[PDB]
Amino acid sequence: TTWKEATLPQVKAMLEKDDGKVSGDTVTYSGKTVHVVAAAVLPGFPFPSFEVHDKKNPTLEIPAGATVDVTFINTNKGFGHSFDITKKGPPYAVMPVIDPIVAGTGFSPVPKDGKFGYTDFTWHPTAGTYYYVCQIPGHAATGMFGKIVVK
Ligand SMILES: [Cu+2]
């Protein structure tokens, strides 16, 4: 996919653009268009994991019919995590069999020269349960995934 580069202050600014509301380990979105901003292993969080709205691998609740704008930022030095959406649930093998990927980013570039790679994609899901996972061998198997409920 097409990756762009952002400086640290830029990363901070984007993270706060997630318009979901957190409740426990759940982030609920509302409206015609929703904006999900996910990051791979923010400093201080467990490895390996995804952070959405400052929460570790939270369950995302999206209204059916809404246009989902996803922004994925890889803030983890040394690894090129991915954010791929599939219908296949856990447990995941070391080499996850999650085809077909409904929407996703593919492997991201590793942080370099004081910048972090990020990308944006749109998704118009049908009601159902999906999962966002990282395809780097072993990551999903060690907990790098979360659930998406479209209802
Ligand atoms: Cu990963």
Swiss-Prot record:
Residues that hold Cu cation according to the record: 81, 134, 139, 144
Domain of life assignment: Bacteria
GO function terms (MF aspect): copper ion binding; electron transfer activity
GO CC, one annotated term: periplasmic space
Stretches of the chain forming a coiled coil according to its record: none
Residue ranges occupied by any Plastocyanin-like domain in the UniProt entry: 49-151
Keyword vocabulary terms for this entry: Copper, Electron transport, Metal-binding, Periplasm, Signal, Transport
The UniProt record lists the keyword Cytoplasm: no
Cofactor: binding comment: Binds 1 copper ion per subunit.
Protein's cellular compartments: Periplasm
Cofactor(s), names only, from the UniProt record: Cu cation
Subunit composition and interactions: Monomer.
Task of the protein: Electron carrier from cytochrome c552 to the A-type oxidase.
Name assigned to this protein: Rusticyanin
The species this protein was found in: Acidithiobacillus ferrooxidans (strain ATCC 23270 / DSM 14882 / CIP 104768 / NCIMB 8455)
Gene that encodes it: rus
